[PDB]
Symmetry: C2
Subunit: 329 residues, 2 copies
Protein backbone atom coordinates (compact mmCIF):
# COMPACT_ATOMS: atom_id res chain seq x y z
CA UNK A 1 0.00 0.00 0.00
CA UNK A 2 1.11 3.60 -0.61
CA UNK A 3 3.21 2.92 -3.74
CA UNK A 4 1.66 4.31 -6.97
CA UNK A 5 2.00 3.61 -10.68
CA UNK A 6 0.95 5.77 -13.60
CA UNK A 7 -1.61 4.32 -15.99
CA UNK A 8 -3.34 5.73 -19.07
CA UNK A 9 -6.29 6.57 -16.78
CA UNK A 10 -4.16 8.20 -14.08
CA UNK A 11 -2.39 7.07 -10.91
CA UNK A 12 -3.32 3.73 -9.26
CA UNK A 13 -2.13 2.06 -6.07
CA UNK A 14 0.55 -0.56 -6.94
CA UNK A 15 -1.46 -3.06 -4.86
CA UNK A 16 -4.41 -2.71 -7.29
CA UNK A 17 -2.40 -3.70 -10.37
CA UNK A 18 -3.01 -7.37 -9.49
CA UNK A 19 -2.42 -10.02 -12.17
CA UNK A 20 -0.23 -8.05 -14.62
CA UNK A 21 1.02 -8.87 -18.13
CA UNK A 22 4.29 -6.97 -18.41
CA UNK A 23 4.93 -7.05 -22.18
CA UNK A 24 1.92 -6.50 -24.42
CA UNK A 25 0.69 -4.19 -27.20
CA UNK A 26 -2.76 -2.84 -28.04
CA UNK A 27 -1.51 -2.08 -31.56
CA UNK A 28 1.97 -2.55 -33.03
CA UNK A 29 2.24 0.23 -35.60
CA UNK A 30 4.43 3.24 -36.47
CA UNK A 31 4.54 6.85 -35.32
CA UNK A 32 1.63 8.77 -36.89
CA UNK A 33 0.27 5.77 -38.81
CA UNK A 34 -3.01 5.19 -36.93
CA UNK A 35 -3.81 8.93 -37.35
CA UNK A 36 -2.88 9.03 -41.05
CA UNK A 37 -4.37 5.71 -42.16
CA UNK A 38 -6.95 4.34 -39.64
CA UNK A 39 -8.67 2.39 -42.50
CA UNK A 40 -5.65 0.10 -42.61
CA UNK A 41 -7.22 -1.42 -39.47
CA UNK A 42 -10.73 -1.36 -40.94
CA UNK A 43 -11.35 1.78 -38.88
CA UNK A 44 -10.20 3.23 -35.58
CA UNK A 45 -13.61 2.17 -34.18
CA UNK A 46 -13.07 -1.46 -35.31
CA UNK A 47 -9.61 -1.48 -33.70
CA UNK A 48 -10.98 -0.16 -30.41
CA UNK A 49 -13.79 -2.72 -30.47
CA UNK A 50 -11.40 -5.62 -31.11
CA UNK A 51 -9.05 -4.48 -28.33
CA UNK A 52 -11.87 -3.96 -25.83
CA UNK A 53 -13.27 -7.45 -26.60
CA UNK A 54 -9.76 -8.89 -26.17
CA UNK A 55 -9.03 -7.10 -22.90
CA UNK A 56 -12.46 -7.99 -21.50
CA UNK A 57 -11.60 -11.62 -22.26
CA UNK A 58 -8.27 -11.30 -20.48
CA UNK A 59 -10.05 -9.58 -17.59
CA UNK A 60 -12.61 -12.44 -17.36
CA UNK A 61 -9.61 -14.82 -17.11
CA UNK A 62 -8.09 -12.81 -14.23
CA UNK A 63 -5.85 -10.21 -15.91
CA UNK A 64 -6.18 -6.82 -14.17
CA UNK A 65 -3.34 -4.81 -15.77
CA UNK A 66 -1.27 -4.86 -18.95
CA UNK A 67 1.92 -2.97 -19.65
CA UNK A 68 1.72 -1.73 -23.22
CA UNK A 69 5.40 -1.52 -24.23
CA UNK A 70 4.63 0.33 -27.50
CA UNK A 71 7.04 3.24 -27.80
CA UNK A 72 6.78 6.34 -29.96
CA UNK A 73 8.14 4.38 -32.97
CA UNK A 74 5.75 1.45 -32.38
CA UNK A 75 3.08 4.10 -33.04
CA UNK A 76 1.82 4.15 -29.46
CA UNK A 77 -1.46 6.10 -29.34
CA UNK A 78 -2.07 6.86 -25.67
CA UNK A 79 -5.59 8.19 -26.40
CA UNK A 80 -6.40 4.76 -27.94
CA UNK A 81 -4.98 3.04 -24.84
CA UNK A 82 -7.04 5.27 -22.52
CA UNK A 83 -10.25 4.53 -24.47
CA UNK A 84 -9.68 0.78 -24.49
CA UNK A 85 -8.67 0.75 -20.79
CA UNK A 86 -11.85 2.60 -19.80
CA UNK A 87 -14.14 0.36 -21.83
CA UNK A 88 -12.52 -2.93 -20.76
CA UNK A 89 -11.89 -2.06 -17.08
CA UNK A 90 -8.26 -3.22 -17.40
CA UNK A 91 -5.41 -0.94 -16.28
CA UNK A 92 -2.87 -0.07 -18.97
CA UNK A 93 0.62 1.23 -18.26
CA UNK A 94 2.11 3.18 -21.18
CA UNK A 95 5.77 3.26 -22.22
CA UNK A 96 8.42 5.70 -23.30
CA UNK A 97 11.76 4.74 -24.91
CA UNK A 98 12.58 3.71 -28.47
CA UNK A 99 12.28 0.43 -30.36
CA UNK A 100 14.07 -0.47 -33.62
CA UNK A 101 12.22 1.86 -36.02
CA UNK A 102 13.28 5.35 -34.92
CA UNK A 103 12.79 8.00 -37.60
CA UNK A 104 15.59 10.42 -38.55
CA UNK A 105 14.37 13.03 -36.03
CA UNK A 106 15.13 10.49 -33.28
CA UNK A 107 18.28 8.96 -34.87
CA UNK A 108 20.02 12.36 -35.01
CA UNK A 109 19.65 12.94 -31.26
CA UNK A 110 22.29 12.90 -28.53
CA UNK A 111 22.10 10.86 -25.32
CA UNK A 112 21.23 14.06 -23.45
CA UNK A 113 18.41 14.88 -25.88
CA UNK A 114 16.99 11.35 -25.72
CA UNK A 115 17.15 11.53 -21.91
CA UNK A 116 15.07 14.72 -22.03
CA UNK A 117 12.54 13.07 -24.34
CA UNK A 118 12.12 10.01 -22.10
CA UNK A 119 11.84 12.24 -19.02
CA UNK A 120 9.18 14.41 -20.74
CA UNK A 121 7.03 11.33 -21.36
CA UNK A 122 7.44 10.11 -17.74
CA UNK A 123 7.30 13.39 -15.81
CA UNK A 124 5.23 15.75 -17.96
CA UNK A 125 3.10 13.53 -20.16
CA UNK A 126 2.85 12.00 -23.59
CA UNK A 127 2.11 14.47 -26.42
CA UNK A 128 -0.44 16.98 -25.05
CA UNK A 129 -2.41 14.42 -23.01
CA UNK A 130 -0.92 14.55 -19.51
CA UNK A 131 -0.76 10.74 -19.58
CA UNK A 132 2.57 9.67 -18.08
CA UNK A 133 4.66 6.65 -19.06
CA UNK A 134 5.26 4.09 -16.33
CA UNK A 135 8.01 2.11 -18.11
CA UNK A 136 10.91 2.71 -20.51
CA UNK A 137 11.14 0.26 -23.55
CA UNK A 138 14.47 -0.16 -25.42
CA UNK A 139 15.62 -2.56 -28.12
CA UNK A 140 18.78 -4.00 -29.59
CA UNK A 141 18.89 -6.05 -32.77
CA UNK A 142 21.96 -8.16 -31.96
CA UNK A 143 25.11 -6.18 -31.14
CA UNK A 144 23.89 -2.70 -30.15
CA UNK A 145 24.21 -0.05 -32.86
CA UNK A 146 25.87 3.23 -31.76
CA UNK A 147 22.41 4.83 -31.67
CA UNK A 148 20.93 1.93 -29.69
CA UNK A 149 23.72 2.37 -27.17
CA UNK A 150 22.65 6.02 -26.76
CA UNK A 151 19.06 4.85 -26.26
CA UNK A 152 20.10 2.35 -23.57
CA UNK A 153 22.13 5.02 -21.76
CA UNK A 154 19.30 7.57 -21.95
CA UNK A 155 16.89 4.89 -20.63
CA UNK A 156 19.21 4.18 -17.69
CA UNK A 157 19.47 7.92 -16.94
CA UNK A 158 15.70 8.47 -17.12
CA UNK A 159 15.21 5.45 -14.85
CA UNK A 160 17.76 6.73 -12.31
CA UNK A 161 15.98 10.11 -12.32
CA UNK A 162 12.41 8.76 -11.91
CA UNK A 163 12.59 5.21 -10.50
CA UNK A 164 10.57 3.93 -13.48
CA UNK A 165 11.73 0.49 -14.74
CA UNK A 166 13.41 -0.34 -18.07
CA UNK A 167 12.31 -3.26 -20.24
CA UNK A 168 14.04 -4.59 -23.31
CA UNK A 169 13.64 -6.30 -26.65
CA UNK A 170 16.40 -8.76 -27.50
CA UNK A 171 17.04 -10.92 -30.56
CA UNK A 172 17.29 -14.70 -30.07
CA UNK A 173 20.95 -14.97 -28.92
CA UNK A 174 23.41 -12.72 -29.50
CA UNK A 175 22.72 -13.36 -26.46
CA UNK A 176 21.98 -9.63 -26.57
CA UNK A 177 20.83 -9.35 -22.99
CA UNK A 178 24.40 -9.51 -21.74
CA UNK A 179 25.51 -6.40 -23.67
CA UNK A 180 22.38 -4.56 -22.53
CA UNK A 181 23.16 -5.41 -18.92
CA UNK A 182 26.79 -4.25 -19.37
CA UNK A 183 25.64 -0.83 -20.68
CA UNK A 184 23.01 -0.43 -17.93
CA UNK A 185 25.57 -1.32 -15.26
CA UNK A 186 28.11 1.15 -16.71
CA UNK A 187 25.43 3.82 -16.06
CA UNK A 188 24.91 2.66 -12.46
CA UNK A 189 21.41 1.26 -13.06
CA UNK A 190 20.24 -1.42 -10.60
CA UNK A 191 19.51 -4.77 -12.33
CA UNK A 192 16.24 -4.96 -10.32
CA UNK A 193 14.98 -1.99 -12.37
CA UNK A 194 15.51 -3.94 -15.61
CA UNK A 195 13.67 -6.69 -17.48
CA UNK A 196 15.65 -8.36 -20.25
CA UNK A 197 12.85 -9.26 -22.65
CA UNK A 198 12.19 -12.04 -25.15
CA UNK A 199 14.36 -14.25 -22.97
CA UNK A 200 12.11 -17.23 -23.81
CA UNK A 201 13.51 -17.07 -27.40
CA UNK A 202 15.93 -19.79 -26.37
CA UNK A 203 16.09 -22.41 -23.60
CA UNK A 204 19.56 -21.27 -22.49
CA UNK A 205 19.27 -21.69 -18.72
CA UNK A 206 22.91 -20.73 -18.02
CA UNK A 207 22.27 -17.39 -19.78
CA UNK A 208 18.92 -16.93 -18.00
CA UNK A 209 20.10 -17.92 -14.52
CA UNK A 210 23.22 -15.77 -15.12
CA UNK A 211 21.03 -12.68 -15.55
CA UNK A 212 18.63 -13.68 -12.77
CA UNK A 213 21.50 -14.28 -10.32
CA UNK A 214 22.65 -10.69 -11.01
CA UNK A 215 19.19 -9.36 -10.09
CA UNK A 216 17.68 -8.86 -13.58
CA UNK A 217 14.10 -9.74 -14.31
CA UNK A 218 13.87 -12.21 -17.16
CA UNK A 219 10.94 -11.61 -19.52
CA UNK A 220 9.42 -14.86 -20.71
CA UNK A 221 7.08 -12.90 -22.90
CA UNK A 222 6.12 -14.76 -26.07
CA UNK A 223 4.10 -17.55 -24.44
CA UNK A 224 1.50 -18.14 -27.23
CA UNK A 225 3.91 -17.93 -30.18
CA UNK A 226 3.90 -21.64 -30.94
CA UNK A 227 2.31 -23.37 -33.92
CA UNK A 228 2.48 -26.32 -36.33
CA UNK A 229 1.82 -26.54 -40.08
CA UNK A 230 2.95 -23.05 -41.11
CA UNK A 231 5.64 -24.16 -43.62
CA UNK A 232 3.53 -22.96 -46.58
CA UNK A 233 3.42 -19.51 -44.93
CA UNK A 234 6.79 -17.76 -44.64
CA UNK A 235 5.59 -14.63 -42.81
CA UNK A 236 3.59 -16.59 -40.20
CA UNK A 237 6.41 -19.12 -39.73
CA UNK A 238 8.78 -16.26 -38.81
CA UNK A 239 6.55 -15.38 -35.82
CA UNK A 240 5.56 -18.80 -34.49
CA UNK A 241 7.94 -21.42 -33.07
CA UNK A 242 7.66 -25.18 -33.67
CA UNK A 243 8.39 -25.48 -29.91
CA UNK A 244 5.03 -26.22 -28.27
CA UNK A 245 3.72 -23.54 -25.90
CA UNK A 246 4.23 -26.23 -23.24
CA UNK A 247 8.02 -25.92 -23.85
CA UNK A 248 7.95 -22.17 -23.28
CA UNK A 249 5.92 -22.70 -20.12
CA UNK A 250 8.44 -25.34 -18.92
CA UNK A 251 11.10 -22.58 -18.95
CA UNK A 252 9.14 -20.75 -16.26
CA UNK A 253 9.16 -23.93 -14.19
CA UNK A 254 12.88 -24.47 -14.93
CA UNK A 255 13.70 -21.06 -13.46
CA UNK A 256 11.43 -21.57 -10.45
CA UNK A 257 13.04 -24.99 -9.81
CA UNK A 258 16.47 -23.32 -9.79
CA UNK A 259 15.42 -20.76 -7.18
CA UNK A 260 14.61 -17.77 -9.38
CA UNK A 261 10.83 -17.40 -8.87
CA UNK A 262 11.31 -13.72 -7.90
CA UNK A 263 13.14 -12.87 -11.14
CA UNK A 264 10.51 -13.98 -13.68
CA UNK A 265 8.01 -11.91 -15.68
CA UNK A 266 5.51 -13.71 -17.92
CA UNK A 267 3.61 -12.22 -20.88
CA UNK A 268 2.40 -12.82 -24.46
CA UNK A 269 3.70 -9.96 -26.61
CA UNK A 270 0.19 -10.13 -28.08
CA UNK A 271 -1.64 -7.35 -29.96
CA UNK A 272 -4.97 -6.46 -31.58
CA UNK A 273 -3.54 -4.66 -34.62
CA UNK A 274 -0.23 -5.02 -36.43
CA UNK A 275 0.67 -2.66 -39.27
CA UNK A 276 4.45 -3.04 -38.93
CA UNK A 277 4.27 -6.47 -40.55
CA UNK A 278 2.54 -8.18 -43.48
CA UNK A 279 -1.07 -7.41 -44.36
CA UNK A 280 -3.72 -9.68 -42.77
CA UNK A 281 -1.21 -11.15 -40.29
CA UNK A 282 -3.92 -10.81 -37.57
CA UNK A 283 -6.02 -13.50 -39.27
CA UNK A 284 -3.17 -16.00 -38.85
CA UNK A 285 -2.40 -14.92 -35.30
CA UNK A 286 -5.99 -15.01 -34.07
CA UNK A 287 -6.56 -18.47 -35.55
CA UNK A 288 -3.48 -19.78 -33.72
CA UNK A 289 -4.22 -18.07 -30.38
CA UNK A 290 -7.94 -17.20 -30.23
CA UNK A 291 -7.60 -16.64 -26.47
CA UNK A 292 -5.32 -13.63 -27.10
CA UNK A 293 -4.16 -12.13 -23.80
CA UNK A 294 -6.15 -14.71 -21.78
CA UNK A 295 -3.75 -17.44 -22.99
CA UNK A 296 -1.41 -17.09 -20.00
CA UNK A 297 -4.09 -17.36 -17.25
CA UNK A 298 -6.19 -19.95 -19.14
CA UNK A 299 -3.40 -22.26 -20.33
CA UNK A 300 0.04 -21.45 -18.93
CA UNK A 301 -0.80 -20.96 -15.26
CA UNK A 302 -2.99 -24.12 -14.92
CA UNK A 303 -0.33 -26.14 -16.79
CA UNK A 304 2.29 -24.99 -14.26
CA UNK A 305 -0.02 -25.70 -11.33
CA UNK A 306 -0.73 -29.16 -12.72
CA UNK A 307 3.06 -29.69 -12.94
CA UNK A 308 3.28 -28.97 -9.20
CA UNK A 309 4.22 -25.29 -9.10
CA UNK A 310 2.67 -23.99 -5.83
CA UNK A 311 -0.25 -21.53 -6.23
CA UNK A 312 1.60 -19.06 -3.95
CA UNK A 313 4.60 -19.18 -6.32
CA UNK A 314 2.35 -18.57 -9.35
CA UNK A 315 0.76 -15.59 -7.58
CA UNK A 316 4.26 -14.31 -6.80
CA UNK A 317 5.22 -14.47 -10.49
CA UNK A 318 2.04 -12.91 -11.89
CA UNK A 319 1.29 -10.33 -9.12
CA UNK A 320 4.23 -9.66 -6.78
CA UNK A 321 7.00 -9.55 -9.39
CA UNK A 322 5.17 -7.06 -11.67
CA UNK A 323 4.24 -4.91 -8.65
CA UNK A 324 7.86 -4.79 -7.44
CA UNK A 325 9.06 -4.06 -10.99
CA UNK A 326 6.59 -1.28 -11.78
CA UNK A 327 6.83 0.45 -8.38
CA UNK A 328 9.09 3.48 -8.93
CA UNK A 329 12.18 2.70 -6.93
Amino acid sequence: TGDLINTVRGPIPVSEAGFTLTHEHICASSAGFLRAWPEFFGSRKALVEKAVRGLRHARAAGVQTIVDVSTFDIGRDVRLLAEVSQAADVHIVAATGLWFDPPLSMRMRSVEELTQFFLREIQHGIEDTGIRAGIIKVATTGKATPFQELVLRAAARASLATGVPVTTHTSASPRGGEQQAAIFESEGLSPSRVCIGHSDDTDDLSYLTGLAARGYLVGLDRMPYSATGLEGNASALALFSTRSWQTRALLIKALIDRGYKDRILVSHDWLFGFSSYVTNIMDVMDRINPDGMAFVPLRVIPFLREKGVPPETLAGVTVANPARFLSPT
Copy 2:
Protein backbone atom coordinates in the same frame (compact mmCIF):
# COMPACT_ATOMS: atom_id res chain seq x y z
CA THR B 1 -9.95 30.79 -64.74
CA GLY B 2 -12.12 27.84 -63.66
CA ASP B 3 -9.25 25.47 -62.74
CA LEU B 4 -8.92 24.83 -58.97
CA ILE B 5 -6.19 23.64 -56.63
CA ASN B 6 -6.50 22.32 -53.10
CA THR B 7 -4.70 24.24 -50.37
CA VAL B 8 -4.52 23.78 -46.60
CA ARG B 9 -7.27 26.44 -46.35
CA GLY B 10 -9.49 24.88 -49.01
CA PRO B 11 -9.93 25.18 -52.77
CA ILE B 12 -8.51 28.22 -54.64
CA PRO B 13 -8.68 29.27 -58.28
CA VAL B 14 -5.44 28.24 -60.06
CA SER B 15 -5.20 31.83 -61.35
CA GLU B 16 -4.89 33.10 -57.74
CA ALA B 17 -1.84 30.98 -56.92
CA GLY B 18 0.36 33.67 -58.51
CA PHE B 19 4.10 33.66 -57.76
CA THR B 20 4.54 30.07 -56.48
CA LEU B 21 7.50 28.30 -54.85
CA THR B 22 7.06 24.66 -55.83
CA HIS B 23 9.42 22.90 -53.40
CA GLU B 24 9.45 24.17 -49.83
CA HIS B 25 8.89 22.97 -46.26
CA ILE B 26 7.39 24.66 -43.21
CA CYS B 27 9.12 22.06 -41.02
CA ALA B 28 11.26 19.08 -42.05
CA SER B 29 10.61 16.53 -39.32
CA SER B 30 9.34 12.96 -38.85
CA ALA B 31 5.91 11.39 -38.52
CA GLY B 32 4.52 12.11 -35.03
CA PHE B 33 7.58 14.07 -33.87
CA LEU B 34 6.09 17.58 -33.62
CA ARG B 35 3.20 16.12 -31.56
CA ALA B 36 5.46 14.05 -29.28
CA TRP B 37 8.29 16.56 -28.76
CA PRO B 38 7.24 20.16 -29.67
CA GLU B 39 9.91 21.52 -27.23
CA PHE B 40 12.57 20.32 -29.66
CA PHE B 41 11.56 23.42 -31.65
CA GLY B 42 11.40 25.61 -28.54
CA SER B 43 7.62 25.19 -28.63
CA ARG B 44 4.93 24.69 -31.25
CA LYS B 45 4.05 28.38 -30.73
CA ALA B 46 7.66 29.46 -31.46
CA LEU B 47 7.70 27.33 -34.63
CA VAL B 48 4.44 28.86 -35.86
CA GLU B 49 5.72 32.36 -35.11
CA LYS B 50 8.99 31.78 -37.00
CA ALA B 51 7.15 30.32 -40.01
CA VAL B 52 4.58 33.12 -40.09
CA ARG B 53 7.36 35.75 -39.94
CA GLY B 54 9.18 33.93 -42.75
CA LEU B 55 6.13 33.55 -44.99
CA ARG B 56 5.11 37.18 -44.40
CA HIS B 57 8.61 38.14 -45.58
CA ALA B 58 8.24 35.99 -48.69
CA ARG B 59 4.78 37.49 -49.24
CA ALA B 60 6.20 41.06 -48.96
CA ALA B 61 8.72 40.04 -51.67
CA GLY B 62 5.93 38.81 -53.98
CA VAL B 63 5.45 35.12 -53.09
CA GLN B 64 1.73 34.23 -53.02
CA THR B 65 1.83 30.41 -52.74
CA ILE B 66 4.23 27.71 -51.55
CA VAL B 67 4.00 23.99 -52.17
CA ASP B 68 5.00 22.26 -48.95
CA VAL B 69 6.39 18.94 -50.21
CA SER B 70 6.59 17.44 -46.69
CA THR B 71 5.14 13.94 -46.81
CA PHE B 72 3.87 11.78 -43.97
CA ASP B 73 7.46 10.69 -43.17
CA ILE B 74 8.78 14.28 -43.28
CA GLY B 75 6.37 14.76 -40.36
CA ARG B 76 3.97 16.96 -42.30
CA ASP B 77 1.50 18.55 -39.86
CA VAL B 78 -1.33 19.90 -41.99
CA ARG B 79 -2.89 21.71 -38.99
CA LEU B 80 0.43 23.58 -38.58
CA LEU B 81 0.40 24.45 -42.29
CA ALA B 82 -3.20 25.70 -42.09
CA GLU B 83 -2.38 27.92 -39.07
CA VAL B 84 0.71 29.42 -40.68
CA SER B 85 -1.10 29.93 -44.03
CA GLN B 86 -3.95 31.79 -42.33
CA ALA B 87 -1.66 34.04 -40.29
CA ALA B 88 0.73 34.85 -43.16
CA ASP B 89 -1.86 35.19 -45.96
CA VAL B 90 0.20 32.85 -48.18
CA HIS B 91 -1.45 29.83 -49.84
CA ILE B 92 0.07 26.47 -48.96
CA VAL B 93 -0.42 23.31 -51.02
CA ALA B 94 0.12 20.12 -48.99
CA ALA B 95 1.62 16.87 -50.26
CA THR B 96 1.04 13.15 -50.10
CA GLY B 97 3.59 10.48 -51.12
CA LEU B 98 6.63 9.14 -49.29
CA TRP B 99 10.17 10.42 -48.84
CA PHE B 100 13.20 8.36 -47.74
CA ASP B 101 12.25 7.75 -44.08
CA PRO B 102 9.19 5.50 -44.29
CA PRO B 103 8.51 3.57 -41.08
CA LEU B 104 7.90 -0.21 -41.11
CA SER B 105 4.12 0.26 -41.40
CA MET B 106 4.75 1.95 -44.77
CA ARG B 107 7.68 -0.26 -45.89
CA MET B 108 5.57 -3.44 -45.59
CA ARG B 109 2.90 -2.15 -47.98
CA SER B 110 2.09 -3.24 -51.54
CA VAL B 111 1.82 -0.91 -54.53
CA GLU B 112 -1.97 -1.25 -54.33
CA GLU B 113 -1.98 -0.32 -50.63
CA LEU B 114 0.30 2.69 -51.18
CA THR B 115 -1.95 3.79 -54.05
CA GLN B 116 -4.93 3.71 -51.67
CA PHE B 117 -3.02 5.74 -49.09
CA PHE B 118 -2.01 8.44 -51.59
CA LEU B 119 -5.57 8.57 -52.96
CA ARG B 120 -7.00 8.92 -49.41
CA GLU B 121 -4.82 11.99 -48.81
CA ILE B 122 -5.81 13.56 -52.17
CA GLN B 123 -9.50 12.63 -52.39
CA HIS B 124 -10.67 12.27 -48.79
CA GLY B 125 -8.27 14.32 -46.71
CA ILE B 126 -5.20 14.11 -44.54
CA GLU B 127 -5.73 12.42 -41.15
CA ASP B 128 -9.14 13.58 -39.86
CA THR B 129 -8.82 17.16 -41.16
CA GLY B 130 -10.51 17.16 -44.57
CA ILE B 131 -7.45 18.98 -45.94
CA ARG B 132 -6.58 17.47 -49.32
CA ALA B 133 -3.11 17.07 -50.81
CA GLY B 134 -2.49 18.87 -54.08
CA ILE B 135 0.79 17.15 -55.00
CA ILE B 136 2.46 13.74 -54.64
CA LYS B 137 6.15 13.77 -53.34
CA VAL B 138 8.43 10.74 -53.97
CA ALA B 139 12.14 10.15 -53.45
CA THR B 140 14.94 7.92 -54.64
CA THR B 141 18.37 7.79 -53.04
CA GLY B 142 20.38 6.78 -56.12
CA LYS B 143 19.21 3.58 -57.82
CA ALA B 144 15.61 3.07 -56.66
CA THR B 145 15.16 0.49 -53.89
CA PRO B 146 12.42 -2.12 -54.51
CA PHE B 147 10.20 -0.23 -52.06
CA GLN B 148 10.94 3.13 -53.71
CA GLU B 149 9.92 1.60 -57.03
CA LEU B 150 6.56 0.68 -55.46
CA VAL B 151 6.22 4.27 -54.20
CA LEU B 152 6.93 5.68 -57.67
CA ARG B 153 4.37 3.34 -59.25
CA ALA B 154 1.73 4.16 -56.61
CA ALA B 155 2.43 7.89 -57.18
CA ALA B 156 1.94 7.47 -60.93
CA ARG B 157 -1.33 5.59 -60.34
CA ALA B 158 -2.67 8.18 -57.87
CA SER B 159 -1.73 10.93 -60.35
CA LEU B 160 -3.48 9.16 -63.24
CA ALA B 161 -6.59 8.78 -61.05
CA THR B 162 -6.72 12.41 -59.80
CA GLY B 163 -4.70 14.61 -62.19
CA VAL B 164 -2.56 15.81 -59.27
CA PRO B 165 1.15 16.26 -60.19
CA VAL B 166 4.13 14.22 -58.94
CA THR B 167 7.33 15.84 -57.71
CA THR B 168 10.58 14.11 -56.86
CA HIS B 169 13.69 14.15 -54.73
CA THR B 170 16.83 12.98 -56.52
CA SER B 171 20.42 12.54 -55.33
CA ALA B 172 23.15 14.49 -57.16
CA SER B 173 23.70 12.17 -60.19
CA PRO B 174 22.92 8.88 -60.36
CA ARG B 175 21.52 10.81 -62.47
CA GLY B 176 18.47 9.40 -60.66
CA GLY B 177 15.92 11.41 -62.59
CA GLU B 178 16.30 9.14 -65.60
CA GLN B 179 15.26 5.98 -63.71
CA GLN B 180 12.34 7.86 -62.14
CA ALA B 181 11.17 8.96 -65.58
CA ALA B 182 11.50 5.37 -66.89
CA ILE B 183 9.26 4.03 -64.08
CA PHE B 184 6.69 6.83 -64.51
CA GLU B 185 6.56 6.22 -68.26
CA SER B 186 6.13 2.46 -67.75
CA GLU B 187 2.96 3.38 -65.79
CA GLY B 188 1.69 5.64 -68.60
CA LEU B 189 2.18 8.89 -66.66
CA SER B 190 2.57 12.05 -68.76
CA PRO B 191 5.97 13.76 -68.22
CA SER B 192 4.11 17.11 -67.94
CA ARG B 193 2.62 15.83 -64.66
CA VAL B 194 6.10 15.31 -63.22
CA CYS B 195 8.82 17.52 -61.74
CA ILE B 196 12.22 15.88 -61.37
CA GLY B 197 13.52 17.70 -58.30
CA HIS B 198 16.94 18.79 -57.03
CA SER B 199 18.00 19.00 -60.65
CA ASP B 200 20.21 22.02 -59.79
CA ASP B 201 22.48 19.59 -57.84
CA THR B 202 24.67 19.48 -60.93
CA ASP B 203 25.19 21.68 -64.00
CA ASP B 204 24.60 18.77 -66.40
CA LEU B 205 22.71 20.53 -69.20
CA SER B 206 22.55 17.43 -71.45
CA TYR B 207 20.76 15.58 -68.61
CA LEU B 208 18.51 18.58 -67.88
CA THR B 209 17.62 19.38 -71.50
CA GLY B 210 17.12 15.62 -72.07
CA LEU B 211 14.37 15.57 -69.42
CA ALA B 212 12.93 18.93 -70.50
CA ALA B 213 12.78 17.85 -74.16
CA ARG B 214 10.68 14.85 -73.04
CA GLY B 215 8.19 17.18 -71.31
CA TYR B 216 9.37 16.89 -67.68
CA LEU B 217 9.52 19.88 -65.41
CA VAL B 218 12.99 20.35 -64.01
CA GLY B 219 13.08 21.50 -60.39
CA LEU B 220 15.88 23.96 -59.76
CA ASP B 221 14.96 24.01 -56.12
CA ARG B 222 17.95 24.62 -53.85
CA MET B 223 18.66 28.21 -54.90
CA PRO B 224 20.01 29.58 -51.55
CA TYR B 225 22.16 26.56 -50.64
CA SER B 226 25.47 28.23 -51.35
CA ALA B 227 28.09 29.34 -48.82
CA THR B 228 31.80 29.90 -48.15
CA GLY B 229 33.92 29.22 -45.05
CA LEU B 230 32.08 26.17 -43.70
CA GLU B 231 35.08 23.77 -43.74
CA GLY B 232 35.26 23.76 -39.92
CA ASN B 233 31.60 22.63 -39.88
CA ALA B 234 30.98 19.19 -41.39
CA SER B 235 27.18 19.14 -41.00
CA ALA B 236 26.69 22.63 -42.49
CA LEU B 237 29.16 21.90 -45.33
CA ALA B 238 27.04 18.89 -46.36
CA LEU B 239 24.07 21.21 -47.02
CA PHE B 240 25.72 24.23 -48.65
CA SER B 241 27.59 24.22 -51.97
CA THR B 242 30.79 26.19 -52.67
CA ARG B 243 29.09 27.09 -56.00
CA SER B 244 27.84 30.66 -55.58
CA TRP B 245 24.06 31.12 -55.68
CA GLN B 246 24.79 33.05 -58.90
CA THR B 247 25.91 29.71 -60.47
CA ARG B 248 22.64 28.02 -59.55
CA ALA B 249 20.73 30.98 -60.96
CA LEU B 250 22.77 30.80 -64.19
CA LEU B 251 21.35 27.28 -64.71
CA ILE B 252 17.88 28.80 -64.98
CA LYS B 253 19.19 31.16 -67.64
CA ALA B 254 21.03 28.28 -69.39
CA LEU B 255 17.76 26.37 -69.76
CA ILE B 256 15.85 29.46 -70.91
CA ASP B 257 18.58 30.20 -73.48
CA ARG B 258 18.19 26.67 -74.86
CA GLY B 259 14.43 27.06 -75.33
CA TYR B 260 13.13 25.37 -72.18
CA LYS B 261 11.54 28.31 -70.29
CA ASP B 262 8.25 26.35 -70.00
CA ARG B 263 9.91 23.36 -68.33
CA ILE B 264 11.51 25.10 -65.32
CA LEU B 265 10.36 25.28 -61.70
CA VAL B 266 12.35 27.39 -59.23
CA SER B 267 12.36 27.06 -55.43
CA HIS B 268 14.53 27.07 -52.28
CA ASP B 269 13.86 23.82 -50.41
CA TRP B 270 13.89 26.14 -47.38
CA LEU B 271 12.30 25.46 -43.98
CA PHE B 272 11.63 27.03 -40.57
CA GLY B 273 12.32 23.92 -38.48
CA PHE B 274 14.52 20.90 -39.13
CA SER B 275 14.52 17.99 -36.69
CA SER B 276 15.63 15.35 -39.22
CA TYR B 277 19.18 16.71 -39.09
CA VAL B 278 21.71 17.93 -36.52
CA THR B 279 20.64 20.04 -33.55
CA ASN B 280 20.80 23.84 -34.03
CA ILE B 281 21.22 23.51 -37.81
CA MET B 282 18.68 26.39 -38.20
CA ASP B 283 21.19 28.84 -36.68
CA VAL B 284 23.66 28.07 -39.48
CA MET B 285 21.02 28.14 -42.19
CA ASP B 286 19.43 31.41 -41.11
CA ARG B 287 22.81 33.14 -40.89
CA ILE B 288 23.63 32.06 -44.46
CA ASN B 289 20.20 32.90 -45.94
CA PRO B 290 18.44 35.41 -43.64
CA ASP B 291 15.97 36.16 -46.45
CA GLY B 292 14.59 32.60 -46.22
CA MET B 293 11.86 32.06 -48.81
CA ALA B 294 12.20 35.65 -50.10
CA PHE B 295 15.66 34.79 -51.51
CA VAL B 296 14.32 33.82 -54.95
CA PRO B 297 12.25 37.00 -55.58
CA LEU B 298 14.78 39.33 -53.88
CA ARG B 299 18.01 37.94 -55.37
CA VAL B 300 17.50 35.32 -58.08
CA ILE B 301 14.82 37.00 -60.18
CA PRO B 302 16.50 40.47 -60.29
CA PHE B 303 19.85 38.80 -61.11
CA LEU B 304 18.22 37.03 -64.07
CA ARG B 305 16.50 40.23 -65.20
CA GLU B 306 19.80 42.10 -64.97
CA LYS B 307 21.35 39.34 -67.14
CA GLY B 308 18.73 40.10 -69.80
CA VAL B 309 16.05 37.49 -69.13
CA PRO B 310 12.78 39.16 -70.24
CA PRO B 311 10.30 40.02 -67.43
CA GLU B 312 7.58 38.08 -69.32
CA THR B 313 9.82 34.98 -69.29
CA LEU B 314 10.45 35.36 -65.54
CA ALA B 315 6.71 35.67 -64.93
CA GLY B 316 6.20 32.55 -67.05
CA VAL B 317 8.67 30.59 -64.89
CA THR B 318 7.39 31.78 -61.50
CA VAL B 319 3.62 31.98 -62.25
CA ALA B 320 2.56 30.16 -65.42
CA ASN B 321 4.68 27.04 -65.01
CA PRO B 322 3.54 26.37 -61.39
CA ALA B 323 -0.09 27.03 -62.39
CA ARG B 324 0.10 24.56 -65.29
CA PHE B 325 1.86 22.01 -63.07
CA LEU B 326 -0.52 22.22 -60.11
CA SER B 327 -3.73 22.31 -62.18
CA PRO B 328 -5.18 18.79 -61.99
CA THR B 329 -4.88 17.47 -65.52
